[PDB]
Amino acid sequence: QSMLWVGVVSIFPEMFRAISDYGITSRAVKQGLLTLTCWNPRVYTEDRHQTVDDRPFGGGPGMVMKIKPLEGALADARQAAGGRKAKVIYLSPQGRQLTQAGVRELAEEEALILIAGRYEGIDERFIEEHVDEEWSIGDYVLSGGELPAMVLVDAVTRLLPGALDGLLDCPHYTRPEVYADKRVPEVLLSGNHEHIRRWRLQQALGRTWERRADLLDSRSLSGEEQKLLAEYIRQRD
Amino acid sequence: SMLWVGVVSIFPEMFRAISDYGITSRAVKQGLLTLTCWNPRVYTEDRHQTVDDRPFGGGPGMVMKIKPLEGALADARQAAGGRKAKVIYLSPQGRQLTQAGVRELAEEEALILIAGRYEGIDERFIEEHVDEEWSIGDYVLSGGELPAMVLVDAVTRLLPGALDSAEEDSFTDGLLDCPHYTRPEVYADKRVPEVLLSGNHEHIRRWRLQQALGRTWERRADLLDSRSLSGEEQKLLAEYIRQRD
Numbered sequence A: 001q002s003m004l005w006v007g008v009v010s011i012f013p014e015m016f017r018a019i020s021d022y023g024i025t026s027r028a029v030k031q032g033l034l035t036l037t038c039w040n041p042r043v044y045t046e047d048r049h050q051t052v053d054d055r056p057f058g059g060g061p062g063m064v065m066k067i068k069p070l071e072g073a074l075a076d077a078r079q080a081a082g083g084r085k086a087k088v089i090y091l092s093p094q095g096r097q098l099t100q101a102g103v104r105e106l107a108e109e110e111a112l113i114l115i116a117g118r119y120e121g122i123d124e125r126f127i128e129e130h131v132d133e134e135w136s137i138g139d140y141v142l143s144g145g146e147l148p149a150m151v152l153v154d155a156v157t158r159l160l161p162g163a164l165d166g167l168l169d170c171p172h173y174t175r176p177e178v179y180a181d182k183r184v185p186e187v188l189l190s191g192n193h194e195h196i197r198r199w200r201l202q203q204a205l206g207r208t209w210e211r212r213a214d215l216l217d218s219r220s221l222s223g224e225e226q227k228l229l230a231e232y233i234r235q236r237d
Numbered sequence B: 001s002m003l004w005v006g007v008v009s010i011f012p013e014m015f016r017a018i019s020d021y022g023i024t025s026r027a028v029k030q031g032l033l034t035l036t037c038w039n040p041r042v043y044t045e046d047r048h049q050t051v052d053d054r055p056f057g058g059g060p061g062m063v064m065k066i067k068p069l070e071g072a073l074a075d076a077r078q079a080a081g082g083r084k085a086k087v088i089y090l091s092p093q094g095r096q097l098t099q100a101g102v103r104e105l106a107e108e109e110a111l112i113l114i115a116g117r118y119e120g121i122d123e124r125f126i127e128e129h130v131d132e133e134w135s136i137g138d139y140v141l142s143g144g145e146l147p148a149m150v151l152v153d154a155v156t157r158l159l160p161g162a163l164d165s166a167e168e169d170s171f172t173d174g175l176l177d178c179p180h181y182t183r184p185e186v187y188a189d190k191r192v193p194e195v196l197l198s199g200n201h202e203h204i205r206r207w208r209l210q211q212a213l214g215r216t217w218e219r220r221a222d223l224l225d226s227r228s229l230s231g232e233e234q235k236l237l238a239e240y241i242r243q244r245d
């Protein structure tokens, strides 16, 4: 049926309209490249206002997500994935940092179940028991895992065949040619493909070196790349 | 309001994800947070003009034109009124967002966030109008709307009276967080550590600090290279490593 099956465990399934109703994610859902389902732990509660948080053992601020509701939603999602190999990922700052390399890897999966936490987190025993991998979108703290989940799905969905390198991007220009006495680089106005390719590559290399030299220390460069970057540096004020 | 945020995006209605749900929503209600959106497609020259156009020199995709973005930003700037607004473009070429960066961003009176789409925005717009470029991580998304929402969420957490606790979470003390436990005492033949059931407040503090240190050491030793260890922290971490088994 679909290339990527995603099940999201979240108490705010309504938030995932941002990727289901918009962009390539929406387009992939309609094309059937991407199957997106939501599983509200709040529905697998058996009480008052469908409470899914409790007070933490040992005290402290905040609340913790109870096991029982989470258990429900995850069991349902696992069933819903069928005979697909589903990786269960918890979105948390304690997880492995998401990078483009990590995204390419994640795009090879046939099914993902994403747990979005709220409050202080979920019970460590749930994680021990049910979670295959922990992923972080960066070294900052968000109020929940819904946005991280959606970030992950967006990045991964981009790489799916028929949806649409360690360098930063070149600058981009479009109409008009001149705007408030700021003209577009001449090289992009000459129809020459080879000059344009060389200039963009060099600008990419230059910006990478200027702002993210760490990306250059990981990736070894081609001979042409070394020359173009050298020329960039030596010809800059 | 304490924080005024204006978002420049061609999908303003996508921001219902933070305006209608979670602490961002309740911060808006409470009046800590003002959230506004500005669709550049409504600021074009005429209504037969798209916000995007073909990239000069070719290449895949389209680029966002400067005229629409310039209009929307003028409107947002005007709306922010007396406030010092910082104009942020969400880009992979930006500064890496970290919790330190978030604390700093939460001291601003007003933020105007430009969410690009397609290949990006015209470089001349950035050159002229953008104060700061921020990246939420080293990966490529289809647009800046989710990055913008990430930024607003993180910042809104630090607004006095928004909420867990903002001064006890991960990255605050340079460490990862400890594990958390709640009812029941035993689940799937796994018990809550006794320290959290019977222990005093000193035992629990020391236990949580040790777990923090241990998890950081296991998963994120790079964090420990930047923040030094004290004598007590080295002993607690040594003990963690030797009792890992």
Ligand SMILES: O=C(N[C@H]1CCCN(c2cc(-c3ccncc3)n[nH]2)C1)c1cc2ccccc2[nH]1
Binding pocket: A164, B060, B061, B090, B091, B092, B115, B116, B117, B118, B119, B120, B121, B134, B135, B136, B137, B138, B139, B140, B141, B142, B143, B144, B147
């Ligand atoms: O990089 C692209 N688009 C960007 C343009 C500027 C704003 N968008 C964005 C922001 C981010 C981002 C922001 C903050 N932190 C991490 C990523 N990723 N992508 C979308 C891009 C889209 C695209 C489509 C086909 C071929 C090449 C392509 N490149």
Ligand SMILES: C[S@@+](CC[C@H](N)C(=O)[O-])C[C@H]1O[C@@H](n2cnc3c(N)ncnc32)[C@H](O)[C@@H]1O
Binding pocket: A091, A092, A093, A094, A115, A116, A117, A118, A119, A120, A121, A122, A135, A136, A137, A138, A139, A140, A141, A142, A143, A144, A145, A146, A148, B164, B168, B169, B170, B176, B177
């Ligand atoms: C506010 S957090 C608290 C997490 C935990 N107490 C800590 O500080 O490490 C609650 C939820 O937000 C989500 N979250 C926060 N920051 C995240 C990030 N950088 N990446 C992925 N998920 C995140 C997690 O799903 C987490 O369960």
